Write an enzyme that holds these catalytic residues in place. Structure first.
Site, mmCIF file in Angstrom:
data_model
loop_
_atom_site.group_PDB
_atom_site.id
_atom_site.type_symbol
_atom_site.label_atom_id
_atom_site.label_comp_id
_atom_site.label_asym_id
_atom_site.label_seq_id
_atom_site.Cartn_x
_atom_site.Cartn_y
_atom_site.Cartn_z
ATOM 1 N N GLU A 174 0.821 -1.203 0.000
ATOM 2 C CA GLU A 174 0.000 0.000 0.000
ATOM 3 C C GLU A 174 0.861 1.262 0.000
ATOM 4 O OE1 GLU A 174 -3.037 0.427 -0.554
ATOM 5 O OE2 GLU A 174 -4.037 -1.508 -0.174
ATOM 6 N N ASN B 148 -7.466 9.241 -5.809
ATOM 7 C CA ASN B 148 -8.309 8.255 -6.456
ATOM 8 C C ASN B 148 -9.216 8.901 -7.492
ATOM 9 O OD1 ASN B 148 -7.327 6.269 -4.592
ATOM 10 N ND2 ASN B 148 -8.633 7.221 -3.042
ATOM 11 N N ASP C 252 -12.335 8.763 -7.900
ATOM 12 C CA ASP C 252 -13.566 9.335 -7.368
ATOM 13 C C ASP C 252 -13.369 10.676 -6.666
ATOM 14 O OD1 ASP C 252 -12.497 8.632 -4.895
ATOM 15 O OD2 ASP C 252 -14.041 7.128 -4.440
ATOM 16 N N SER D 193 -11.543 11.148 -3.899
ATOM 17 C CA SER D 193 -10.959 10.904 -2.597
ATOM 18 C C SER D 193 -9.449 10.692 -2.741
ATOM 19 C CB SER D 193 -11.617 9.685 -1.942
ATOM 20 O OG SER D 193 -11.255 8.484 -2.605
ATOM 21 N N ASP E 231 -6.115 8.419 -0.642
ATOM 22 C CA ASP E 231 -5.677 7.436 0.344
ATOM 23 C C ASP E 231 -4.444 7.976 1.070
ATOM 24 O OD1 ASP E 231 -7.632 5.635 -0.629
ATOM 25 O OD2 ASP E 231 -6.185 4.206 -1.439
ATOM 26 N N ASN F 34 -8.773 5.817 3.289
ATOM 27 C CA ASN F 34 -9.498 6.591 2.281
ATOM 28 C C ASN F 34 -10.347 7.713 2.885
ATOM 29 O OD1 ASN F 34 -12.195 6.667 0.365
ATOM 30 N ND2 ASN F 34 -10.288 6.415 -0.775
ATOM 31 N N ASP G 234 -15.387 -3.785 9.516
ATOM 32 C CA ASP G 234 -16.555 -3.229 8.852
ATOM 33 C C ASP G 234 -17.353 -4.265 8.080
ATOM 34 O OD1 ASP G 234 -18.009 -0.697 7.984
ATOM 35 O OD2 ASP G 234 -17.343 -1.435 6.022
#
EC number: 3.2.1.17
Length: 128
Positions: A35, A46, A48, A50, A52, A59, A101
């Site tokens: 990562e 990203n 979209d 957003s 990271d 995120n 989650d």
């Protein structure tokens, strides 16, 4: 801070990630390797809108606030900048929420594509 491999393993273990939600320490070290390359300062935008953040690429759409992400929920109630610190505490505490989650470590795409199903205990070889 760019952590050493065993240095990061020891910090993650101290903070209780080893076997958290059933994921052994090598899974977490492998995830961080792919990562962020063990770099607490890593950031990546990203598609979209957003971003990271940090050693575990958390995120800004769901988990931390960066002030520029549409639809932000900030479930880990933290500025995303706090996830870039040399101290991994905030990233660990938020990762614990993420992995709980429902989808486990599949939330980390690099873990899913590069660690899952592999000999992850190699990532803690040589570590005390």
């Amino acid at each position: 801070k760019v952590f050493g491999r065993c240095e990061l393993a020891a910090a993650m273990k101290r903070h209780g990630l080893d076997n958290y939600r059933g994921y052994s320490l090598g899974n977490w070290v492998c995830a961080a390797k792919f990562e962020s390359n063990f770099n607490t300062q890593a950031t990546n935008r990203n598609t979209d809108g957003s971003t990271d953040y940090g050693i575990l690429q958390i995120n800004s759409r769901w988990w931390c606030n960066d002030g520029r992400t549409p639809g932000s929920r900030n479930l880990c109630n933290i500025p995303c900048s706090a996830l870039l610190s040399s101290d991994i505490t905030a990233s660990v505490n938020c990762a614990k929420k993420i992995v709980s989650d429902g989808n486990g470590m599949n939330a980390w795409v690099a873990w899913r594509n590069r660690c899952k199903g592999t000999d992850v205990q190699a990532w803690i070889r040589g570590c005390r």
